[PDB]
Amino acid sequence: MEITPSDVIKTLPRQEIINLGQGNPDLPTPPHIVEALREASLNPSFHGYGPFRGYPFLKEAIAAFYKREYGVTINPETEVALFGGGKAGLYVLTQCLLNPGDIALVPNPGYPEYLSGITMARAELYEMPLYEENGYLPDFEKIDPAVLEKAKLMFLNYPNNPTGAVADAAFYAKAAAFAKEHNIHLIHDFAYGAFEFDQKPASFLEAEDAKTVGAELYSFSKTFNMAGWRMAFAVGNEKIIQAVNEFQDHVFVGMFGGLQQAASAALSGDPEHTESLKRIYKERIDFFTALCEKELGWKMEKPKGTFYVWAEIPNTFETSHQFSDYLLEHAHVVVTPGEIFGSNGKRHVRISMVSKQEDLREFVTRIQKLNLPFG
Amino acid sequence: MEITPSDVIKTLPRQEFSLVFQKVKEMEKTGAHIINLGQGNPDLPTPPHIVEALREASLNPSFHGYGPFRGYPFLKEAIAAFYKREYGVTINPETEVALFGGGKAGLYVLTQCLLNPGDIALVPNPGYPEYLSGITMARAELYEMPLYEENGYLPDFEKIDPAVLEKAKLMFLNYPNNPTGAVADAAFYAKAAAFAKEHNIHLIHDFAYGAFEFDQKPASFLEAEDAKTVGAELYSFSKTFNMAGWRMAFAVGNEKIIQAVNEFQDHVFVGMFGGLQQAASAALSGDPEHTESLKRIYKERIDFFTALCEKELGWKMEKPKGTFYVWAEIPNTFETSHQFSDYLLEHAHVVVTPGEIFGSNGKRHVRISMVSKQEDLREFVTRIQKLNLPFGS
């Protein structure tokens, strides 16, 4: 009788043909990042253990990146921690900031792994609904004042998975001011922060009192098509980072020097690379949503951010799950049912613009042979 | 008011971390030159064929995107093949293999996937400090299994209070042993497996130094009857292949423990860079020559060092049966392991690891790693001699 712990058994199975499901970038990592890894790997200094907290040269790159892109001042020796990807960062941050029985404030809809780190910390979730009428921003006023004392952590995510909503500096000032009043650690998930199409994407850390209450998680995965490389960092409050450092001292010994060099080449590289990629996603979104309306009758929002389209399922379907499953079965295409993002996602699917045109057209046309009432 | 979790404020300070810091400060200001025989950090480089495997693999755009969450099949198959070749052990790679970003991460994950709050874990004393770290993060109770020299540092299972065995859900063992250099044989593993099954204890065998038994063929815990029934084995690339910095490891064992591991890591990981997995695959299927030759270097250093230490200091120390570690008694003039090691740092400028880091049975011992070439080991002795301490007893 092998016995898993309560943590394991209460965790859900992870839910992640034309695949417009997983948000897996299809374009390669830029060549200069690959060359940096290839070159660094020859350096025997990286074959052995290095600094537990990661190399200074990477932490210096991170601060310089945050100054260049967002005008934010980051002390690299104290306000930066490294993670093996944003998924691991979310987990570490949650374990460092939540005790069993504390309340975590989580958007609905929202990235499903927020709920999961909260579960391994044995904490209680309280939902902040995201409604289109509010621009998919939370109404902090509608949170039960009784939970606020017990609420220790809040998750926010803009540009937003799965809705593509964006937030401006005034929303972040309000969020931080709210978090301050109620002693809530605020984690901003900036995994799509390269991808706001109209305005320059604003960091949470531009807002007054942001660094006081919280931190920003930045992934390499989407910005630089480095999803496979498993690299991320957090920037923010010095106390948060010290806690992270203390946890990770027992769990890791930094990460391969070659990867860190590659990450340093990514951050200091020309921004024109990322803008080009942003242009590619933008053109695919125009292609896709125009062809959907014209050839199917499916009227879709164009997202303000990210490479995701959030579309309403036909009136004749029970749940996003069945609709999703109808498409995989009969049309042989993958979309992500909105339900995995929370109850507020029912009746929507998330569709990822991580395929080239040829696959996006064949998506639409395969679905035409189904003649659904998108009207 | 930033408020760390109770898990963090309840952790020990990582000692290798506090030392890295101490040393770095010393090297900077003023200009101390230090011989560091503390952390077991391999001084020799990763073999070139492993390095080139990574270099070629990184050009493969299939690895630039998300891969399979639980690892690439080609690696798990290479792991099964390796265990069959080195040890007699048949391993099902689709169900009995899990990948980790290093053995230290493995330990944390296995602890979290196997212990509930209040559960009891059986931990060797002396033992690797991270065993105790993960337990505490799991909010579990620690019970010690003394490792005594007279027993060859193998635990006496019969001596565990039978009242503990019900709440005991986990046991760590570790041979070739850190810090003692002790080794285990097939009979010992059979006895451990027998004992684990008879009391329903998940058994984790840490095989981080499994390449480094000098006088015999190293024996896998999985070679034992009942082994895959009650537990799993942790293997690291760190020491075998001078890949400490690459952060790669795996567990092989009971398919139920592995599924538990997989259910955790699906939510925290999605594997690691495919370039590193191919590099590991090439390490595993590579010629044992590299490893055999690496082993011989470590042994000649141990022979040199312990000889020299007797000759020049009157410091007599038992040669280890495995690992690159020497486990040595501290002078009687010294009160503790820490104040002895602090003294050698400050006065000689040499690092050794205080034994008390490994548990109460390591007070009065230090661990010294043979991770510098002979003439650096000679300078190490030379520096200590200049202190004239009474290494006689």
State the DSSP string of A261-318: HHHHHHHHS-THHHHHHHHHHHHHHHHHHHHHHHHH----PPPSBSSEEEEEPPTT-S
Which residues in chain B touch residue A13, judged by CB atoms under 8 angstroms apart? 263, 266
| Nearest residue, CB atoms, B266 vs list A14, A25, A225 | A14
Q: A230–B268: do the CB atoms touch at under 8 Å?
A: no
Distance from CA of B388 to the nearest CA of A (A): 33
Report the Cα B245 to chain-centroid distance in Å. 14
> What are the tokens at A239?
């106390």
Could you list the beta-strand ranges (E) of B185-296. Answer: 202-206, 231-236, 249-253
Pairwise CA distance, residues A129 & A151, whole Å: 16
Q: Which positions ≥6 away from B290 have C-beta within 8 Å? A: B47, B241
Q: What is the DSSP letter of A143?
A: S
Q: Which residues of chain B are in CATH 3.40.640.10 domains?
A: 65-286
Amino acid at B7: D
Distance from CA of A5 to the nearest CA of B (A): 5
The torsion angle over the Cα atoms of residues A168, A171, A177 and A183, rounded to 10 degrees, is -100
Q: A34–B274: do the CB atoms touch at under 8 Å?
A: no
Which residues in chain B touch residue A113, judged by CB atoms under 8 angstroms apart? 267
By CA distance, what is A257's nearest residue in B? Answer: B245
Q: A95–B7: do the CB atoms touch at under 8 Å?
A: yes
By CA distance, what is A226's nearest residue in B? Answer: B64
| Nearest residue, CB atoms, B65 vs list A3, A85, A228 | A228
Pairwise CA distance, residues B116 & A84, whole Å: 26
Q: B267–A14: do the CB atoms touch at under 8 Å?
A: yes
Contact predicate A348/A13, CB 8 Å: no
For residue B9, give the nearest of A117, A299, A29, A95 by alpha carbon: A95
Pairwise CA distance, residues A178 & B183, whole Å: 59
For residue A168, give the nearest of A128, A214, A199, A131 by alpha carbon: A199
In sign, the C-alpha dihedral spanning B89, B93, B94, B100 is: positive
Contact predicate B46/B66, CB 8 Å: no
By CA distance, what is A239's nearest residue in B? Answer: B2
Contact predicate A201/A159, CB 8 Å: yes
Q: A230–B104: do the CB atoms touch at under 8 Å?
A: no
For residue B3, give the nearest of A358, A150, A48, A52 by alpha carbon: A150
Q: 3-class SS at A83?
A: strand
Question: B267, B277, B290: which to substitute to probe chain A, counting the most A Cβ within 10 Å?
Answer: B267
Measured at the CA of A243, the angle between CA A255 and CA A204, to 5 degrees, comes to 85
Residues pairing with A308 in the sheet: A352
Asked if B198 reaches chain A (Cβ–Cβ under 8 Å), the answer is: no
Q: B202–A3: do the CB atoms touch at under 8 Å?
A: yes
Q: How many CA atoms lie within 13 A of A207 on its CB side?
A: 27
> What are the tokens at A356?
């080239």
Q: Which positions ≥6 away from B311 have C-beta within 8 Å? A: none
Pairwise CA distance, residues B268 & A319, whole Å: 28
Pairwise CA distance, residues A154 & A114, whole Å: 10
Q: A38–B58: do the CB atoms touch at under 8 Å?
A: yes
Distances (CA, A) of A274 to A59, B61, B133, B179: 21, 18, 41, 49
For residue A281, give the nearest of A358, A357, A229, A190 by alpha carbon: A357
Pairwise CA distance, residues B107 & B104, whole Å: 5
Pairwise CA distance, residues B117 & A71, whole Å: 45
**Residue that has been written with the tokens 């684990």 in this structure:** B196
Pairwise CA distance, residues A109 & A125, whole Å: 13
Asked if A255 reaches chain B (Cβ–Cβ under 8 Å), the answer is: yes
Which residues in chain B touch residue A243, judged by CB atoms under 8 angstroms apart? 4-5, 8
Q: Give resolution, Å, one decimal.
A: 1.9
By CA distance, what is A41's nearest residue in B? Answer: B51
Distance from CA of A217 to the nearest CA of B (A): 15
Say if domain B65-286 classifies as CATH 2.10.109.10. Answer: no
State the DSSP string of B296-339: HHHHHHHHHHHHHHHHHH----PPPSBSSEEEEEPPTT-S-HHH
Q: How many helices (H) and strands (E) does chain B have?
A: 14, 12
* Start-end of H helices in A165-269: 169-181, 210-213, 238-251, 257-268
> What are the tokens at A75?
């002390």
Q: B51–A28: do the CB atoms touch at under 8 Å?
A: no
Q: Which residues of chain A are in CATH 3.40.640.10 domains?
A: 48-269
Distances (CA, A) of B189 to B157, B209, B225: 12, 16, 9
Asked if A253 reaches chain B (Cβ–Cβ under 8 Å), the answer is: yes
Q: What is the DSSP letter of B147?
A: -
Pairwise CA distance, residues A252 & A153, whole Å: 24
Which residues in chain A touch residue B68, judged by CB atoms under 8 angstroms apart? none
Query: Is there a cis peptide before residue B126, judged by omega within 30 degrees of 0?
Result: yes
Pairwise CA distance, residues A228 & B64, whole Å: 5
CATH topology of domain A48-269: Aspartate Aminotransferase; domain 2 (3.40.640)
Q: What technique solved it?
A: X-ray
Q: Are strands A348-352 and B120-125 parallel, antiparallel or unpaired?
A: unpaired
Distance from CA of A323 to the nearest CA of B (A): 25
Pairwise CA distance, residues A111 & A155, whole Å: 10
